[PDB]
C-alpha cells in the first residue's frame, strides 16, 4: 500500500521489544491519553526542551499499547511514525509528494480511527516542502486525525503559536525537565540495558554520582540525556580497558613510541633519563598487569574521569602527583613570585579547598581582590597561577579593565543584544568561559573601570552565572575571578612599617569602601593586601631575571657568569621602595643589556667563551677569556 | 491588464457619477492643477493628518474632469491609484517589489502619459528594505509620471527630506483638518446621499451637534472621518429601531448615546460649589473661592495668553489640600489622575532648575527631561501641584513668572509647553500657627489679609502679584475629620462588600477610630494610617484562620481599649 511504504511502525518494534525501557512519566502518559481521547482540539503535541524524552514518551506509549495498560478504547491501536523525508525522496515530478500525502491520508481514513499518527518534530511539518501544513489542515479541522507531535518550546512558539489558525487543533502537553531521582530510576533500567550491551557491570552509587555530577557541572545540556551519555561513555571506557590493557600502560606505550619516533629523528639530549625511566616503568607496569591477571566494573571514579575529560574540571581521583604538585604549588608560587606570603596563602588555600570538594557550589572558586602598589607582582602572581594550573602564562581570561572606561563596553565583555551589529559573536568573557568552564579570569586593574561594570561583577561573584545578550546563561562556578588594584598605594607605602596586617587591611579596606560599591566589597571572597619589596626580595627578583637573561643568551650562543659585587650595584642602583621591582628591571636593562648588545653587535664579544660580567668602579664591564 | 491588478480607475465611476459629490477644498485642487500643468516635476504631494479626504480631493478633481471644469491639458486623463502595501507584502525575495514596479512602469509607458496616478504614504516608498526612489526618481524627473502623493509632514521630514533629490520633485500641498463648519458644509453636501440611501431624513441640528461633540470629546479619528462615522452608525441605529418590530430623523440624543457609549458640562460648572462638596466636607469659603475662580476662567474675560488660574495655598498640610486637588482634577477635566505632585523642598540650586525645566543638550538629564514640563507634555489638561514653595531657589520664581505671564515655557529640549489648560496649585505652610491658633471666631477675609501681608513679607511681591487668590485652609474641626473618617469607613465597607461581608460598627468604636490619629499639626493621613493599621491587620488574621463567613453580620464592637469583630 502506502502506509506499508512511507511510514514506520513503532508498535511492531515495541512488540518485538527493540525499544528501550521507559520509566516514570506516569502523569505525562496519563495526560497524553487524556488529550488523545478528547473530542475537540484532539491532537496532542509534546513540548519538551531538548532531551527530556518526548520520543521516549511516545515509545513508552507504544510499549503500553503492547502491554495493554491503555484503556479499552485504545487497544488494537497502531502508532506509525510518519517519516518526513521518506515521502520526499522520490517525488521528482509535479505534486507527487502531494499525491503521497493524500494517499497516506486516504489509507489512514481507511484505518478508520484505529491508528494513531506520530509526527515527530512538528515544526518541520509547519512547512515541510500549500506544501504540507495547509494540506493536513482540513484533515485536522474534521476531527479525523490522531496526530501526535513533539517539539521544543522555541519551535512550537515561533513556528506554531504564531499561526493562530493551528492552535485550535493542538494542545500544550508540556514535558518538564526530570528530577534527579527520576533520573536515578531511568538510569537503573537503562543500566540493565547497557550492561546487556557492553557485557560490563555498573554500580548503583556510580548511578547516583553520575546523576549528581551531571546535574551540577554541565550546565548546557538537559537531563536525563547527559547522565546517560556519562554512563555510556564510561561503559565504552571500561570495555576498552578490558580489551587492550589499562590506560597507564597506554600512557607509557604512547610515550615510548613518541620517544622512539623522536630518537629516530635524531639520527643537547634531555632525553636519556626520560626514555630509560619510562622503559623501566613500562616493564614494571606490564609485570603488574601480568600479576593482577585491571578494571572490569564501573565505579563512580570512572564517571568522574569521563566528566573531567569531557568538561575540563578536575573532578577525577586525586592521585599522588596531584597532592605532591599541590604542596609544591605553594612551593612553586614562591619559586616564581618571591615574597608576598599572604596572596600565595589565600590562593593556595582556595584551590586546595576546591580540589577537596569543600567549595560552595553556588559561587565561583575563589574571587580575589588584589591591592598594593605597582610591581609587587600583582599580574605576575596571576600569570604564575595560570602558568601553574594550565602551564602557560597566556592560558587565562585576561580582561584588561582599563579598556572599559565607557559605560557601554559592557557590550564587549558580555555581548551584543540581538539584531545589532556583531550579535552572533558573543562576548569575550562569556564566550571564553562557556568554551572552558575551568579557567582563571584576570580582571586587570579593576579600579579604572566605569562604575556600572560592577553590576556584572556583582552577578558573577554573587552566583557564578551571567546573562549575556544572546539570552543564555554561563556557568562561572568553576572559575577563579582575580581582580587587581592599587587603591591604597600612598597609605600602604606609608604605614607598612609600625602597623600589623589586620590594621593595614582594615584601613585600606576603608579606603576601598570609599572607592568601590559597598554592595560589591562584601560580595568579594577575600581582599589580600600587599606590601612593597625589600632589598633582598629585589635581589631575589634580580636573580630570577638574570636566570631568564641567561636563558635568552643561551639561545643565541653565549654564556654568562656574573660577578658578586655587580649584583649589589643592581640592588642599589635599581632600588626605591616606591615604584616596586621595575626600577630593578630598568637598571638591569640599561646597566647590562645596553653594553652587552652594544658589544655583540660590534662583533667584539665572541661565542663559545664565557661573558664574565664583572664590575667597573661605578659601571658593569664585560670580558672575554 | 496589469492595470487590472493594482490600479483603480476613478474616472470610471466619476463618468458614472458613482462617487462622492466632493464639495470644498477648492484651493488644494487648484494647486494640484498648478503642479500638474507644469512641464516638469509634475508629481504633487498632499500633506496632512490621515483622514482629511485626500482621496476625496483626487476624486473631486476627477469629477471636475468629467464635468469639464478643468483647463484643456487635464482632459482624457485616467485617474489611477497604486498600492504601496502590496508591492512589499507580496515581495518575498530579491526583485518582486522591483519586478512589479517595472511592469507597472512599462504598462504605463504603453498608456503614453494620459494617466494620473495616486500614491498614499510617500514615506512607505522610501523604506521597503534600493526600492523605488532609484526607480521612480527618473520618472519623477522624466515628467511621464503623473503621481499624486499623500502623507503627513512628520514622516515626510523624517524619511523623505533626508534625500533632497527625492524632495526636489514632489510639491508640498498642505491639507489640514477642516473646521466644524466646513464639516457642516460637506455633510449638507452629503445629507442627500445618506437620505437617498437609507430612505430616511436627517436632523441638521443633530448634524451640527454631532460635529461639535465629535470635535470636543473624541480625538482618535478626526474631521471629516469621525463625523461620517458617527452619522452613518447613528443612522444604522435608527434604521434598526425602525426595522426592529418611531422617527426617520436621526436625533442628537442618539448622537450623545453613541458618543458616550461607543450633556453635563455647563451647569456642572455652575454648580461647582456642590461639586467640590460632593466629596470634601468643610472649607466652605475656599470651595466658593475655587468655584468662582473656575467660573471666571470659564467666563472668558481674561487673557488668552494666561492660564486658568494662579493660586498659592497655605495652612496645615495633609488635611485635604491634596484631596482638594484630586477632586478638583476630577470635576474639572476627568478624574483623580491628571495631576503631578511636586516637592519644591528639593530644588534649591541652579542645577535644580536644570532638573525641573530641562537640561541643556550634552548634559546629564537631557532626554530624561525636565521634571515638570515632560509631565505637562504628557498630560496637557491636568492640575499642577507644588509643595513647600518657600523651599525653592529664587530663580525658579522667574520660571513661575514666565508661567503666570506667558502661559508657556520653553524646556531644555527647545519646544513649546503650553500652560493655558492647567491649574497652578502651590502649597505652603508659612502662616500655619497664624491660622491654627487663631481659627476661633476670626473671619476668612481678614485672616486671608493678615497672612497675605505675612507672605508678602516672606515672598516676592511681584510673585504674589500674579496670584489670583490665596485660600486660607482653616484647620477643620473634629466633626469634619470624623466625617472624613466615616467616608473612609464607607469606602472600606464598599471594598469589603466587594469581598462580600455584612459589616456594622459601634458608635463608641467610631469615636475611638476618630480619636486614633487626630492631630492638627500633621493632617488627616495620620488618622487614615492609624485606623488602617488598627483595623486591617487583625482582621485578615481572624479571616484566614477560618472564622469569618460571607453573610455574617460583623459589628465592630468595642473592647475596653480596642475593637473586637463579632460574627452574628
Amino acid at each position: 500500500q502506502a502506509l506499508k511504504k512511507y511510514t514506520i511502525d513503532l508498535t511492531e518494534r515495541a512488540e518485538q521489544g527493540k525499544l528501550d525501557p521507559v520509566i516514570g512519566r506516569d502523569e505525562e502518559i496519563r495526560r497524553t491519553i487524556q488529550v488523545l481521547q478528547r473530542r475537540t482540539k484532539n491532537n496532542p503535541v509534546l513540548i519538551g526542551e531538548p532531551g527530556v524524552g518526548k520520543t521516549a514518551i511516545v515509545e513508552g506509549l507504544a510499549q503500553r499499547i503492547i502491554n495493554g495498560e491503555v484503556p479499552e478504547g485504545l487497544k488494537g491501536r497502531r502508532v506509525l511514525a510518519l517519516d518526513m523525508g521518506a515521502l520526499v525522496a522520490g517525488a521528482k515530478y509535479r505534486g507527487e509528494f502531494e499525491e503521497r500525502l493524500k494517499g497516506v491520508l486516504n489509507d489512514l481514513a481507511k484505518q478508520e480511527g484505529n491508528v494513531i499518527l506520530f509526527i515527530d518534530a512538528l515544526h518541520t511539518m509547519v512547512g515541510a516542502g500549500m506544501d504540507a501544513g495547509n494540506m493536513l489542515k482540513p484533515a485536522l479541522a474534521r476531527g479525523e486525525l490522531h496526530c501526535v507531535g513533539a517539539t521544543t518550546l522555541d519551535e512550537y512558539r515561533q513556528y506554531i503559536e504564531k499561526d493562530a489558525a493551528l492552535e485550535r487543533r493542538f494542545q500544550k502537553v508540556f514535558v518538564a525537565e526530570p528530577s534527579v531521582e527520576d533520573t536515578i530510576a531511568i538510569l537503573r533500567g537503562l543500566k540493565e540495558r547497557y550492561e546487556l550491551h557492553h557485557h560490563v557491570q555498573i554500580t548503583d552509587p556510580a548511578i547516583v554520582a553520575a546523576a549528581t555530577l551531571s546535574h551540577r557541572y554541565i550546565a548546557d545540556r538537559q537531563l536525563p540525556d547527559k547522565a546517560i551519555d556519562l554512563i555510556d561513555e564510561a561503559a565504552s571506557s571500561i570495555r576498552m580497558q578490558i580489551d587492550s590493557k589499562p590506560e597507564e600502560l597506554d600512557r607509557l606505550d604512547r610515550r615510548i613510541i613518541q620517544l622512539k619516533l623522536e630518537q629516530q629523528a635524531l639520527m643537547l639530549d634531555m632525553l636519556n633519563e626520560e626514555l630509560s625511566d619510562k622503559e623501566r616503568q613500562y616493564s614494571e607496569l606490564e609485570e603488574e598487569w601480568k600479576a593482577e591477571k585491571l578494571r572490569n566494573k564501573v565505579t563512580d571514579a570512572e564517571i568522574a574521569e569521563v566528566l573531567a575529560r569531557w568538561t575540563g574540571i578536575p573532578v577525577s581521583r586525586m592521585m599522588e602527583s596531584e597532592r605532591e604538585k599541590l604542596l609544591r604549588m605553594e612551593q612553586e608560587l614562591h619559586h616564581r613570585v618571591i615574597g608576598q606570603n599572604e596572596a600565595v596563602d589565600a590562593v593556595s588555600n582556595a584551590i586546595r579547598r576546591s580540589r577537596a570538594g569543600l567549595a560552595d557550589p553556588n559561587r565561583p572558586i575563589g574571587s580575589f581582590l588584589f591591592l598594593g602598589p605597582t610591581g609587587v607582582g600583582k599580574t605576575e602572581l596571576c600569570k604564575a597561577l595560570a602558568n601553574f594550573m594550565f602551564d602557560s602564562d597566556e592560558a587565562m581570561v585576561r580582561i584588561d579593565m582599563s579598556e572599559f572606561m565607557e559605560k557601554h563596553s559592557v557590550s564587549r565583555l558580555v555581548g551584543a543584544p540581538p539584531g545589532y551589529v556583531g550579535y552572533e559573536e558573543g562576548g569575550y568573557l562569556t564566550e571564553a568561559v562557556r568554551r572552558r568552564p575551568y579557567s582563571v579570569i584576570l580582571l586587570d586593574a579593576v579600579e579604572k573601570a566605569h562604575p556600572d561594570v560592577f553590576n556584572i561583577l556583582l552577578q558573577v561573584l554573587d552566583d557564578g552565572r551571567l546573562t549575556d545578550g544572546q539570552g543564555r546563561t554561563v556557568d562561572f562556578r568553576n572559575t577563579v575571578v582575580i581582580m587587581t588594584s592599587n587603591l591604597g598605594s600612598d597609605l600602604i607605602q606609608e604605614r607598612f612599617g609600625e602597623l600589623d596586617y589586620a590594621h593595614m587591611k582594615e584601613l585600606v579596606l576603608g579606603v576601598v569602601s570609599h572607592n568601590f560599591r559597598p554592595e560589591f566589597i562584601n560580595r568579594i571572597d577575600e581582599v589580600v593586601v600587599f606590601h612593597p619589596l625589600g632589598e633582598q626580595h629585589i635581589a631575589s627578583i634580580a636573580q630570577i631575571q638574570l636566570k631568564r637573561l641567561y636563558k635568552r643568551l643561551e639561545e643565541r650562543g653565549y654564556e654568562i657568569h656574573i660577578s658578586d659585587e655587580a649584583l649589589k650595584l643592581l640592588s642599589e642602583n635599581g632600588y626605591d621602595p616606591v615604584y616596586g621591582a621595575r626600577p630593578l628591571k630598568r637598571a638591569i636593562q640599561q646597566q647590562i643589556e645596553n653594553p652587552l648588545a652594544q658589544q655583540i653587535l660590534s662583533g667584539e664579544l665572541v661565542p663559545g667563551k664565557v661573558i664574565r660580567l664583572e664590575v667597573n668602579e661605578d659601571r658593569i664591564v664585560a670580558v672575554q677569556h | 491588464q496589469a492595470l487590472k491588478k493594482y490600479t483603480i480607475d476613478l474616472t470610471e465611476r466619476a463618468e458614472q457619477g458613482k462617487l462622492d459629490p466632493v464639495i470644498g477644498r477648492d484651493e488644494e485642487i487648484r494647486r494640484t492643477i498648478q503642479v500638474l500643468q507644469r512641464r516638469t516635476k509634475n508629481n504633487p504631494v498632499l500633506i496632512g493628518e490621515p483622514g482629511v479626504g485626500k482621496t476625496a480631493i483626487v476624486e473631486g478633481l476627477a469629477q471636475r474632469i468629467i464635468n469639464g471644469e478643468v483647463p484643456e491639458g487635464l482632459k482624457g486623463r485616467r485617474v489611477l491609484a497604486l498600492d504601496m502595501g502590496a508591492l512589499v507584502a507580496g515581495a518575498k525575495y530579491r526583485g518582486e517589489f522591483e519586478e512589479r514596479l517595472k511592469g507597472v512602469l512599462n504598462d504605463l509607458a504603453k498608456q503614453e502619459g494620459n494617466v494620473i496616478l495616486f500614491i498614499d504614504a510617500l514615506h512607505t516608498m522610501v523604506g521597503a528594505g534600493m526600492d523605488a526612489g532609484n526607480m521612480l526618481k527618473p520618472a519623477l524627473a522624466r515628467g511621464e509620471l503623473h503621481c499624486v502623493g499623500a502623507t503627513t509632514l512628520d514622516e515626510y521630514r523624517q524619511y523623505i527630506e533626508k534625500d533632497a533629490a527625492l524632495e526636489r520633485r514632489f510639491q508640498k500641498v498642505f491639507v489640514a483638518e477642516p473646521s466644524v463648519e466646513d464639516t457642516i458644509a460637506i455633510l449638507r453636501g452629503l445629507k442627500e446621499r445618506y437620505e437617498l440611501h437609507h430612505h430616511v431624513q436627517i436632523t441638521d441640528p443633530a448634524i451640527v451637534a454631532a460635529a461639535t461633540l465629535s470635535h470636543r470629546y473624541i480625538a482618535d479619528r478626526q474631521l471629516p472621518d469621525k463625523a461620517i462615522d458617527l452619522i452613518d452608525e447613528a443612522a444604522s441605529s435608527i434604521r434598526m429601531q425602525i426595522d426592529s418590530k418611531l422617527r426617520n430623523k436621526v436625533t442628537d440624543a442618539e448622537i450623545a448615546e453613541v458618543l458616550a457609549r461607543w450633556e453635563s458640562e455647563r451647569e456642572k460648572l455652575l454648580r461647582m460649589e456642590q461639586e467640590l462638596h460632593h466629596r470634601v466636607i468643610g472649607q466652605n469659603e475656599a470651595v466658593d473661592a475655587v468655584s468662582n475662580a473656575i467660573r471666571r476662567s470659564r467666563a472668558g474675560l481674561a487673557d488668552p495668553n494666561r492660564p486658568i488660574g494662579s493660586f498659592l495655598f497655605l495652612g496645615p498640610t495633609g488635611v485635604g489640600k491634596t484631596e482638594l486637588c484630586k477632586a478638583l482634577a476630577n470635576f474639572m477635566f476627568d478624574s483623580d489622575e491628571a495631576m503631578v505632585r511636586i516637592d519644591m523642598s528639593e530644588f534649591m540650586e541652579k542645577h535644580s532648575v536644570s532638573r525641573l525645566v530641562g537640561a541643556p543638550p550634552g548634559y546629564v538629564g537631557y532626554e530624561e527631561g525636565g521634571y515638570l514640563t515632560e509631565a505637562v507634555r504628557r498630560r496637557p489638561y491636568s492640575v499642577i501641584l507644588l509643595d513647600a514653595v518657600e523651599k525653592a531657589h529664587p530663580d525658579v520664581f522667574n520660571i513661575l513668572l514666565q508661567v503666570l505671564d506667558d502661559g508657556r515655557l520653553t524646556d531644555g529640549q527647545g519646544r513649546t509647553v503650553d500652560f493655558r489648560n492647567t491649574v497652578v496649585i502651590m502649597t505652603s505652610n508659612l502662616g500655619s500657627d497664624l491660622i491654627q491658633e487663631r481659627f476661633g471666631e476670626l473671619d476668612y477675609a481678614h485672616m486671608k489679609e493678615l497672612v497675605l501681608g505675612v507672605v508678602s513679607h516672606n515672598f516676592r511681591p511681584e510673585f504674589i502679584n500674579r496670584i489670583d487668590e490665596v485660600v486660607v485652609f482653616h484647620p477643620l474641626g473634629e466633626q469634619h475629620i470624623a466625617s472624613i473618617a466615616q467616608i473612609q469607613l464607607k469606602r472600606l465597607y464598599k471594598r469589603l462588600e466587594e469581598r462580600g461581608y455584612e459589616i456594622h460598627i459601634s458608635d463608641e468604636a467610631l469615636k475611638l477610630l476618630s480619636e486614633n490619629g487626630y492631630d492638627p499639626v500633621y493632617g488627616a493621613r495620620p488618622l487614615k494610617r492609624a485606623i488602617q493599621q488598627q483595623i486591617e491587620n487583625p482582621l485578615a488574621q481572624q479571616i484566614l484562620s477560618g472564622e469569618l463567613v460571607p453573610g455574617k453580620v460583623i459589628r465592630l464592637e468595642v473592647n475596653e481599649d480596642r475593637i473586637v469583630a463579632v460574627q452574628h
Partner: peptide, 24 residues
C-alpha cells in the same frame, strides 16, 4: 519534472548609537 530553485533570501541587520554626556 520540476527542479527546486535556489533562492536569493534577502537579509537584515541593525546598529545602535551611544551618546556621551558632560557632567557639570
Amino acid at each position: 519534472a520540476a527542479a527546486a530553485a535556489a533562492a536569493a533570501a534577502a537579509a537584515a541587520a541593525a546598529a545602535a548609537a551611544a551618546a556621551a554626556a558632560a557632567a557639570a
